[PDB]
Design a protein around this ligand. Structure first.
Ligand SMILES: [Br-]
Ligand SMILES: [Br-]
Ligand SMILES: [Br-]
Ligand SMILES: [Br-]
Ligand SMILES: [Mg+2]
Ligand SMILES: [Mg+2]
Ligand SMILES: [Mg+2]
Ligand SMILES: [Mg+2]
Lengths: 470, 470, 470, 470
């Protein structure tokens, strides 16, 4: 049962809009909105959205598998060995937010301080002592972006698995000699860095020039979560504020996906007339090029929504009904909607490019969608015995045979997958967890969870006190 | 009673080295080490130090006043008006960590997200609504380093006050016309940005070319905290590990200051032979040029400790007894001392250049000295009624006349000074507080507080859980 | 009669290899090699070539017209108006080396000091006084690369004409309002800068993603000069030294073009066995990415010449017979061929990326192919009366009615085309001329002209003396 | 007899202002203005000047010797060996425009293409074959500014000699071991690069913080050429146009030097009232920071000419009589004087920062002062036999024992000094010569030579024709 199975199960249920029914539904962890910083919903005058993995949640593991297959096929097409075609995507291996070390060809799970929590070379999980040879301080400088690449998006899941597949394949293929920084095939040397660049380039190619979009749109039921509560929630937002879309995707793809998301024989509620998806938005902006969007952006263009092409020229005019924009900047949105930053709740899945930058550069309020949480929360409550045993052990230790701590940490972690929880390894929080806490005001498995709280709701987090204040 | 009066009072007391006496002394907030992340002291094999405001704690407000006077005198010498000479340093105005906005000439106290907590134009404290004209979202982009300068060092205290003095002076002097971005004097226009640059340049000049060092060394009792427990603590560190100095200051100044710090008619304990300060260190490095030090650094040089000048050439040799180094990098230290990052406790006062960079770039353990805490802690326990009333009010509010919250916030804040606590304004934490929590493993008013804990001590912080884990 | 008609006429003639016949043939301007700096041919141990417009000389105006048509079609496909399809390439308009001013939308012909010689806005040639409003000093800063783009390649000929067509079209189309920096179409504004970027992007697209290569290879007789003397000359070079190819083009295109260039029912001379084109080269390098090639370059790769794809890995091995390389650097060539810079004669058409950089960065000897010279030389000798009259007028003037100088300058210039000679306007030399003189040791309409000189030939230029030395 | 002895001899003669006397005087090479590009003097509406080595020509070798002595003294003061004090400036060694190779510690004289003409390691002149080990292609990449420093100013003369003295000293001092890239003194290694940086820093220090200016102003007769014809020429310029000063020097130094230059018991001509130097200028600008001046510059400031300090603020007002400016940009000058670039003749000695940038960035007309020409011209006419013999030999060779060419080249070169003529080595022109030809419209040993031509004079250079045009 994948996280998207959980989401689709919840999506299939019609909304019970009775106040006590809603209040009772959000008592369950699965349907809750979680709060890092207090947020008075009455102060929000604008709700903004990304599309991919926010409005359009791609089903798992089918979508990652398609991405994986197409990326493999591209690498074979440019000259990688035929044996790559025997790889098959395995959803139990990758966890999001891992760091690929291009020097030594390892996937690393790290905390917020760059300390190593997990290290795998191909499919070999390297134990603590063996890690010291390459990482003498069990530490990486994570801002050394020439060396380290952080795989923090859901689109990076297939390449995370593919990197480990390739390191495994080359290591075990007798044609190649394994060296510290790559593989020797006689007079050819393939560094892990060059191999990584080929994989990154191929994923980009699949998305931007290959058939991923085409294959997705040909079978939207297979690939995209559909929820009749989506139009309902967006209609309620528009009754109390303005609603906008700001997506990096192009208009033609956006229109296909959004049309499917709204394709029900009714509008917001059963029995109401169906309305086109564009009617749910005060402002629609495509080709946003986030994160640059939150600084200088690019010139504001107007989409000819008949031809799907850009009108020639920079658009200098006002916000009008039926206009679709392309490019621009976060300031365009603010100015056109008459909004200040703190009036905006921006809802997206990109912990860096969406949520971090909108918060740091503009002071927008943020809602982070974390699709994996829909399954991680099930594991967390099912296996709470293991975590509680770890707490008790960490407590008893502070005052001999702490191999027990390592073993319980392992058993706990394996419940989430080979690379453990997105949010921790045992008692140590990941970089990803720390970034969520720091930059997401609110977070949840889905933004649809906002449906279960009234719009006057005050989301509350406890005040933080320093050690000397306590 | 200044924070340095508190420190010197504590410094005057001889150490009672009985185990129960030590254990009882660190029960008091004033003598405690505070813990952001757990730290097993038995794992530390090297203790590293900065000099200024760490080993050599400059007395307040005398030292800031000297800096202020010399900076004023430099500005008058280059052509600023004679009226500047009537300014007098006021220690009740500046709090460390304020942001000077060079566009509008305001000092701002901000939280970690750039939200405005306090705004003053000269000596006029601007209320919330009047702030909206210049800061529509009550927010600044703090990484816009062309516009904003963050005054986060103790050496920045005099310029913090001086900026406000100058904005006040020019505003009220009939020769100048106040404009949005500076002052017009007929055919001359002085922007706040140019005025800020002159002040920054003059502070630099005072430190590097003027008489600040000379005036300091002429009266070390007036300007520098002296504590017989300093040699005792450093001797105990050297019994269990290596000790090093890495200072941006030059050897001639370092030698004067350190000689004074160790000038007692005894060594570590009363009755022991006096030993030269250099004997307390396994490695002494001057001219460190931190923060660059924690990346590429500069070439390693050797000090001729007789002439005080650098020997010609890059030093290629080993760590030898009696050698003093200049420049180099953090890697030099690690290699020469045979240390990995996590083996090192680095003790300093610069929350950015010392503590942030050693943690982020190298994974060193960190101890932040915060001299103001020695007085802030007294205010915090004396006026705990006001804070507790604020908690109660914030609680009751969450479920009308919240002018009461603003008033109590003001009365609380004014107990610390005109710009409030270093760590908060009312219930909102400052940027500085957030940076301490994030990058200082341990912190205290003085590193001497380590004397009251055994070297096997396990400093403990509670584990952090995300909202969905709780 | 185009310059490529002249070249093909000369190409059709078999070589008369009698020494007196050769000596007599190079007496004619058309078949001469011109000399800017003395060059002893006996010191050359390696001959290096670019492909495009050097070995493969594209016929004119057919090739420029194809490029033009495809670029227009791309712009219409992305949303430019249908009226663009009525444009037709005119070879009488563009001269190579013009500067597009993106601020004001003018094509400019300039001297080496940035002084204006010709200015056209669309098809309107702007006279001297009217030029002063936009160019107060009749001067541009040609290194302001954000504003000015220098159209110095033969591939830039179609876009040179297309820019002028578009400025004309928009100016005269009643839908748009002409402004100083572009065109207003209601709420859309198209700056000349944005229009220029669309044209540049479309030319790139045609070459790299569109059908230009495909259409070229489908009709090589229409598009490419073929000369049986090419194999003869290259065979003679290989008897006295090494021969290499270093092309930015990919192997698949290179192989098609080169196969056609060598497709005769004989080898070097009539009656000899045909040999594959690759046999004429000691080293073949594709994907060179000049000008970067002359600095750090990219990693050296090996082409699988069966699949046409790159082998995986960096190539670490020696120069072997039958190997084809991709990427690398100029140092790769030198090292693999055992050559020093001055041992190499590098033959190409790119006055910047080939010839300038090989000379300045590596001290290679240079031969610049200037295909237009094959026709310019005919105009120069036919209309020498006009130039001689200009000399006489310039002489008489130096010691009233100099409108005569302007008129004769115009009549002379118009003999070459609307934008005059590549090398001058009247008595003023162009930037392009100055760059040829400075960086081309030797130059000619075709490198085939080397066939008419023996390999011991000493090419001689007169020594340069400063004014004070004369 | 130094070049400044020649200049002062010419300076001592009063001006004979009879038209036939002037016309006859400029017939002599010494008093001529040389012409690279034609310049109609009637089109010049503004004459602009640098001060140092233009208006204020420092006597040789006294001034270079003072610079040398002070630079040596600074290096000894920071820890260089005492033996440096035994060095004594030798004017027969340095020629301007040499390249210091920081990798190998050689001074190189190069042509415009980076080809080696002379190589010296310390005082050892390295012959052609021995040069090949370090320079395999007898070539350097002169834009590799990390490695090569071009000593092209008259202020660089003392450091040119000092670099060679230091390489000689360290090579021959038994304490140091000579290595390929510097000197080893046990555990210290001094690279040529670090040694070069210390010398460069010390020259800067002497000029900006040391006693060079003070020692100069204490004995202006010893150090500065004084010519009663200077006020006469400047007065004549002001009758036909505007006159400005734009100097990097500060006002206090400028005022001392300029006061001395105008200190005669008369004004422009004998018998006229003396006038202050400032009266000769329409605009006076100090602290110019050229070459940045010719781009963005710095903010325009006003000098308080009583206090010598800057008024506070950016100066926003008009050009007024008696105002002195500081900083600004070349555009300030143009706007304030109502000049276009080609209306300005800018007169200076810096072939890069003055003359190159004013020409390339602004299209100003240029007059380069080359003080050494006053003596080089004497050598050129005295030893014309040697050059003529070289021409004849180069001619006879083109159609065996060319050791004769090398010997005559040597004897010729040695007439100018150990590093030969500024402008050539034998028949090969230097980089400096090529830069003069390219960027100086006019040049001379002194700008005073303009006095001998009427202001309607048309300076004529012959038109340049390409090889194919001839
Ligand atoms: Br699509
Ligand atoms: Br001192
Ligand atoms: Br092709
Ligand atoms: Br002075
Ligand atoms: Mg990378
Ligand atoms: Mg600033
Ligand atoms: Mg451009
Ligand atoms: Mg250098």
């Amino acid at each position: 049962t994948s996280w998207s199975d959980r989401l689709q199960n919840a999506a299939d249920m019609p909304a019970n809009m009775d106040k006590h029914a809603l209040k009772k539904y959000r008592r369950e962890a699965y349907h809750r909105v979680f709060v890092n910083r207090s947020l008075a919903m009455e102060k929000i005058k604008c709700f903004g959205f990304d599309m991919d993995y926010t409005l359009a949640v791609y089903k798992s593991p089918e979508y990652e598998s398609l991405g994986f297959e197409l990326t493999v096929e591209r690498l074979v097409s440019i000259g990688y060995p035929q044996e790559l075609l025997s790889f098959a995507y395995d959803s139990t291996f990758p966890t999001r937010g891992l760091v690929f070390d291009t020097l030594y060809g390892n996937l690393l799970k790290v905390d917020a301080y760059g300390n190593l929590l997990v290290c795998a070379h191909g499919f070999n999980f390297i134990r603590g002592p063996e890690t010291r040879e390459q990482y003498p301080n069990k530490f990486i400088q994570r801002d050394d972006t020439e060396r380290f690449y952080i795989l923090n998006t859901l689109f990076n899941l297939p390449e995370t698995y593919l990197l480990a597949c390739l390191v495994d394949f080359f290591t075990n293929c007798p044609r190649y000699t394994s060296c510290e920084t790559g593989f020797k095939d006689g007079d050819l040397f393939m560094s892990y860095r060059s191999m990584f660049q080929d994989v990154r380039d191929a994923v980009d190619w699949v998305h931007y020039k290959g058939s991923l979009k085409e294959k997705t749109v040909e079978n939207l039921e297979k690939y995209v979560v559909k929820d009749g509560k989506l139009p309902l929630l967006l209609s309620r937002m528009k009754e109390v504020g303005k609603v906008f879309l700001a997506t990096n995707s192009d208009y033609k793809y956006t229109d296909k996906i959004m049309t499917y998301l709204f394709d029900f024989p009714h509008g917001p509620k059963p029995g109401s007339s169906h309305r086109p998806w564009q009617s749910y938005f005060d402002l629609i902006l495509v080709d946003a090029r986030k994160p640059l969007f939150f600084g200088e952006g690019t010139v504001l263009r107007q989409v000819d929504t008949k031809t799907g092409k850009l009108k020639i020229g920079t658009y200098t005019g006002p916000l009008q009904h039926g206009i679709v924009y392309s490019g621009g900047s976060s300031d365009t949105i603010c100015d056109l909607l008459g909004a200040k930053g703190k009036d905006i709740l921006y809802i997206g899945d990109h912990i860096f490019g969406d949520i971090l930058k909108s918060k740091k550069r503009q002071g927008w309020r943020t809602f982070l969608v974390i699709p994996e949480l829909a399954q991680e929360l099930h594991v967390w409550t099912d296996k709470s015995s293991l975590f509680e045993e770890l707490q008790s052990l960490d407590i008893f230790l502070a005052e001999s045979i702490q191999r027990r701590i390592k073993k319980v940490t392992h058993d706990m972690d394996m419940c989430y997958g080979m690379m453990g929880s997105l949010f921790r390894s045992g008692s140590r929080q990941t970089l990803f967890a720390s970034q969520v806490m720091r930059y997401a005001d609110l977070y949840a498995a889905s933004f649809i969870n906002l449906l279960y709280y009234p719009f006057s709701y005050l989301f509350r987090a406890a005040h933080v006190l320093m050690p000397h204040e306590s």
